[PDB]
Amino acid sequence: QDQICIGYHANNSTEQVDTIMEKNVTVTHAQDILEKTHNGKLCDLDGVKPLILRDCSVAGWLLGNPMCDEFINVPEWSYIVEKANPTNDLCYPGSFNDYEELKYLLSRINHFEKIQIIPKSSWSDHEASSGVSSACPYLGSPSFFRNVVWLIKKNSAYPTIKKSYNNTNQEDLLVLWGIHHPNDAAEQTRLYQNPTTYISIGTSTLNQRLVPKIATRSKVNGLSSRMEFFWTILKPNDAINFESNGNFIAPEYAYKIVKKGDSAIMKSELEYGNCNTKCQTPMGAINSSMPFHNIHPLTIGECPKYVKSNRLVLATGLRNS
Amino acid sequence: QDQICIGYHANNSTEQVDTIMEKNVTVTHAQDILEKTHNGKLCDLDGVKPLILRDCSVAGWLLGNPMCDEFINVPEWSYIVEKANPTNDLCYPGSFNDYEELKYLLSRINHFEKIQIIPKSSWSDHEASSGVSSACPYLGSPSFFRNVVWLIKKNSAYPTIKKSYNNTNQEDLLVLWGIHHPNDAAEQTRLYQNPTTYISIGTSTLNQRLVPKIATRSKVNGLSSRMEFFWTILKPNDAINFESNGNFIAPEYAYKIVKKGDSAIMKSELEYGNCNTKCQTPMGAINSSMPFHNIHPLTIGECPKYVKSNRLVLATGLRNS
Amino acid sequence: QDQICIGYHANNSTEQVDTIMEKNVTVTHAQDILEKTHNGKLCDLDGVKPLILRDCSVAGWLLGNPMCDEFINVPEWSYIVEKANPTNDLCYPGSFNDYEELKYLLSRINHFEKIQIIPKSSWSDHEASSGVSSACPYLGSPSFFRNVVWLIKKNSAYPTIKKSYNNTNQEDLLVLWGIHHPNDAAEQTRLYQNPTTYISIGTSTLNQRLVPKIATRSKVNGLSSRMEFFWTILKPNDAINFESNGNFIAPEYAYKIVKKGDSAIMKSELEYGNCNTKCQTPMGAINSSMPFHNIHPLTIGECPKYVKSNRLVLATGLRNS
Amino acid sequence: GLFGAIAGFIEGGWQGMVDGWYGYHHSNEQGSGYAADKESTQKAIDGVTNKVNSIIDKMNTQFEAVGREFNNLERRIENLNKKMEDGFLDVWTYNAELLVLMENERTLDFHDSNVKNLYDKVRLQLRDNAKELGNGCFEFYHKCDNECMESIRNGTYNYPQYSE
Amino acid sequence: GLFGAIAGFIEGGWQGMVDGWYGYHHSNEQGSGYAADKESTQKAIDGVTNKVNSIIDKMNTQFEAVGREFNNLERRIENLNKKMEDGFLDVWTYNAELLVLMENERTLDFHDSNVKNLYDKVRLQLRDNAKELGNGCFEFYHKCDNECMESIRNGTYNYPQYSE
Amino acid sequence: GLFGAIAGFIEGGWQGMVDGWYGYHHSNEQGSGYAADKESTQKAIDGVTNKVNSIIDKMNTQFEAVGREFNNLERRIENLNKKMEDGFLDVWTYNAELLVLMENERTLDFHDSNVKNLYDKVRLQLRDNAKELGNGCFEFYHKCDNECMESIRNGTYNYPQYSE
Numbered sequence A, B, C: 001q002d003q004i005c006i007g008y009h010a011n012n013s014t015e016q017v018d019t020i021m022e023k024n025v026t027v028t029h030a031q032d033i034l035e036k037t038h039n040g041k042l043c044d045l046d047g048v049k050p051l052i053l054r055d056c057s058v059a060g061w062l063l064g065n066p067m068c069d070e071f072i073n074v075p076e077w078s079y080i081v082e083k084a085n086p087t088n089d090l091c092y093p094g095s096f097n098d099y100e101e102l103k104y105l106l107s108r109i110n111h112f113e114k115i116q117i118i119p120k121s122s123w124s125d126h127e128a129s130s131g132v133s134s135a136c137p138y139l140g141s142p143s144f145f146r147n148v149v150w151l152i153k154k155n156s157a158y159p160t161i162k163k164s165y166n167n168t169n170q171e172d173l174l175v176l177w178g179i180h181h182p183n184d185a186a187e188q189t190r191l192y193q194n195p196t197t198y199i200s201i202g203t204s205t206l207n208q209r210l211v212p213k214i215a216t217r218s219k220v221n222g223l224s225s226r227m228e229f230f231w232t233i234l235k236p237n238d239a240i241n242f243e244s245n246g247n248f249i250a251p252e253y254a255y256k257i258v259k260k261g262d263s264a265i266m267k268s269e270l271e272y273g274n275c276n277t278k279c280q281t282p283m284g285a286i287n288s289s290m291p292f293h294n295i296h297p298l299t300i301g302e303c304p305k306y307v308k309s310n311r312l313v314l315a316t317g318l319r320n321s
Numbered sequence D, E, F: 001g002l003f004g005a006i007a008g009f010i011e012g013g014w015q016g017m018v019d020g021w022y023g024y025h026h027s028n029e030q031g032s033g034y035a036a037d038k039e040s041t042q043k044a045i046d047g048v049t050n051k052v053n054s055i056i057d058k059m060n061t062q063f064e065a066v067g068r069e070f071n072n073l074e075r076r077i078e079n080l081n082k083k084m085e086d087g088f089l090d091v092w093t094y095n096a097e098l099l100v101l102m103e104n105e106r107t108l109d110f111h112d113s114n115v116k117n118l119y120d121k122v123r124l125q126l127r128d129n130a131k132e133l134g135n136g137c138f139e140f141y142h143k144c145d146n147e148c149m150e151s152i153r154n155g156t157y158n159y160p161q162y163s164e
């Protein structure tokens, strides 16, 4: 006789998909839309290399911890990598005012240019080279943060300082300074003669007045004293004004923000790989066309969408048996 | 012969819809559920008219900037319209404590009633009519904020002020006051004789003590001095207590909150249209029955749901060819 | 003749379901997945009993309000129940610094152990048993918070206190203390001789200095004076240092955090039932296998998912008529 | 055509039918004409009306949005605010668009179903007494006037009418 | 009836069938009775069981909610907290309700499909040897006892049984 | 098999067909072979390509995530941050997974539809001139060479070819 039949494709594929009513359905064709692989490295992001603070933190970096000299002058970065628990932070115990806000600002910056706004040589009637501690040691000798200067008395006298700086630049300035909180009145007089002191700082926007708190505290890094740091952003053509009769950790270097942009502060224990990528996560870089990944929520660059699934397979062909 | 046929409607409609598997499918009937039109005006909201601060901000309004007299007495509003960058704000440079929190409070208020809590005439042993500046000018002559009074010394003396005010009303009171931070000790004595001063303010809930910060700062509106403003909400039958020996910008007028309600603070460059609406957005009002719009997320009144789509058309009829 | 027919099940069920295109469709079988019932009681949560502050608040409890002695020593709790408006809070008017942050900490704690860190007997040169008020009465006689001690002058003298406490324990310590803000200079001298006083408190992390604010304020509980309370968490092997020449409400008892865990602070007007549960809400406990409930968003324990629906019924059988 | 009726074995639609979505075209002794099936058309009407109002009603409590302002040192929570409001905006935009895409398809294929089942409703009546042309038309072996037609279009076609 | 079987060409359901969702009713020499199709009924069971547990399992990580308190001058972030928690509450409520609305429909029409395909499974067996009544019943031209019936209801009907 | 074609009345698939998803197998005088239906296969291709790109495109503005840090006394807003980001993560994970589950099913049944409608496209051509076997095959009463076959597989089968 003669016959015609109608039928459908079948092949040797073992690619299963899931539906709402049935799991593990073997089908002919299926596309995977979920990327599950990274390279386990910290790579450049489109040619521009990350800033990898190793055992230094942002505070140690910006203030100039003597153990952080690797990052004395830092080129443009794509993103910053800090460890969960950096060992080189504030060598001299104390605190950093609005620290998290500053880190947040850093997520918006790609390049700093460190400039000298006040030379150490410009301190006529005070000692600018004796402000060092064994808690901030450099090569087994007492040092201190490099970008700020711990001013002490000269010839048993601390004359009131009035110093102003006009931001002649067109970039915004990150300006850092500090106050010293001694452990006792004896230390206060030993360091700055004057018993009762202050630091007043003013801009167009800022108007603050710090007073040292002299008190016994538990020891941290062998010290009961503390340093408290502050920062501000000087607008172009605005000036910053300092007036102090003691306890003043003057600024020396400030930071020009020459490149605003989209950046991020990653917490990763990883170190620099020598690679490039378009998408980076704390655990490694991604090379994918896939629309989804399940590697890490925190991501930088042209990336797939993070999703909590370990399997997303979309059916293209028909049922197979 | 004889025949019957079964078939379906077709018409002359060019209304396309989209599906998951096919785009631009021409069909017979389709309903549109997305509103894409506003009138480009700032309208009344159901009969009650908005408050449109023009080149004044909320701070300039509430403190009584001499250039903001248009809004000296303001009737019930539906919503407030402030520009992104109002020119008439704090004529005398300085700051407003908890400003954003106060704006937020304003999003909950529909009507203020300005009442006089302390007459200028009640300042016996101080000068109440000399506290004016060329930075807050009115008609080319030195003035000042109208709702607060800048008290200075009288006959080379500033006796300590103790003034209390019991909120005999049943509405809550917005009470504003301020402190003056001079540029130098000479100005401090020129204005208030007393070298070392303070302002203490107390209620049932509030207990603060302000001290002036005397320091050189960069000039803003020609001034290196600053004014710092504060506000509080006096409950019915609670009292506010002021004690000061200088630098005190006393309150004169306060604000009764007679109408709490749902309001909003819109940022719009637009000006008042002479219209009514049920739904307002920063770019214009909406007259729609449609369940969705794509005009602006920020909305006030009986409004459709904001959505980021430029097209949402739902099929009602069948496929057409 | 002979016949075979194909057909489907039908039964006597009145269980309706809804679809996108039709409401109230009677079907044969349907499963309900929404729990709508609680028992209206406050029950134990898997054997461990809640802490039910009745008319005491967290502040009254921790500070030791004399009217809160029911909770002088409190065993491990599953969760805490506070009323919307507790009557026994700060008997002496004033405030509690970072109160909400502390409540938040409490949502992470299941068990405190109150320990004595400074005996009242250890106050040699000050009076430790006269610091009582009629605003904090116990049994119709002036008392005060039990866990802190209001130190006053002894023999018309208030010598500067220096007291330190090393946390020898391995649990973290909640340490509470306070400052007294008098109404007038006469009260300041009546209580502490010294006109100008301070309290300085230091740890490895903390470095603060409180100064009393002397001023007239409106009366609350008959008083114009105020108490301001502070707290900190002492790490194991860290010490806390107090130095003060007046206005110091010293700590006496502190709290060991011996059991961290998942807890919650419920606002409920309800009182203890004598029951057990696996899932608790402010309005009552739940005994369900259902995946959803619509009772209350705030929940503790192994609970269904809160959802705003009053009806969720899923069809299992087929259409019925 | 998921059910193969519309743009399937039926080659297109009737401009002439203006009283419903599905209907019949007859040609007899007394003349020819069109007649929409009020039943299936009515059920369809309730189907799409209920679908429409279900989609609208399901999405009336979306996410409103109130303005909040933050100063220069509240950049983190300003960012949090911004990202959360845009977040909700995005999930709801996605919800609306997606739902439209799904129910449009289900609606079209619902019409397809209606036509196919109408055709079958007739085919099961005019068994041997008519032949299937293949275009949705039936050719009669007997003679059907406007009363045999009316009786078909209400389900009461009397097959007792011989054959051959 | 998207597939036209249930409440379509079949006028309703059999109270008498109590052993499954779909089945047969026979009437022969030896008597009459009902018998549910264990195959299609079992597959249906796995279909709705798997659907149910899929819907439950897909939505177990919803949004929990912890209480946070804010003072008089933290009104903005209190508002942010409140609006975000209500926001999630709303998107998840919408998700649950919507999903129910969709899968209910798909389930009913799945039953419709099962019945239609069962009917066809038979119709394709009893070709010329029986006539289609139109109500889901087949009238035999030959004689089928309980063994011809059993052989039908397991797919092994032997058409070799002449005609006319 | 929602439409009963694939794994329904057709017992399985043809390894031999390698040029499309649906097609024919013929056996005549000149020989036997397979031939995929370019029409339905092409429409299917556009169907799944468009579905895929629709699902991808609908979900490109998901929720990004930026790191924010909080100190020891910002525990409440740190918690708020954490819970909101995990919240969005969860709603989007749910969206992706759910959408996959739905459109996989709709896709498979779409193939089923294609096969069934192809079969019908033929069945409606070879009316009396062939008998329905029941497995998706037609047995001819006349004789069809590769030209009658080609004319079938493009819709132009000329029924005028007698019977009996």
Ligand SMILES: *[C@@H]1O[C@H](CO)[C@@H](O)[C@H](O)[C@H]1NC(C)=O
Pocket: A166, A167, A168, A237, A238, A239, B218, B219
């Ligand atoms: C900074 O210097 C420039 C020119 O030297 C001047 O225009 C500007 O006023 C200065 N800025 C301030 C605020 O002193």
Ligand SMILES: *[C@@H]1O[C@H](CO)[C@@H](O)[C@H](O)[C@H]1NC(C)=O
Pocket: B166, B167, B168, B237, B238, B239, C218, C219
């Ligand atoms: C305000 O005045 C009323 C009556 O004059 C009085 O009852 C109330 O105590 C006063 N408020 C305060 C706190 O002084």
Ligand SMILES: *[C@@H]1O[C@H](CO)[C@@H](O)[C@H](O)[C@H]1NC(C)=O
Pocket: A218, A219, C166, C167, C168, C237, C238, C239
């Ligand atoms: C607490 O005491 C222990 C031993 O007595 C000591 O190791 C530790 O240094 C003390 N803590 C501080 C910070 O004083």
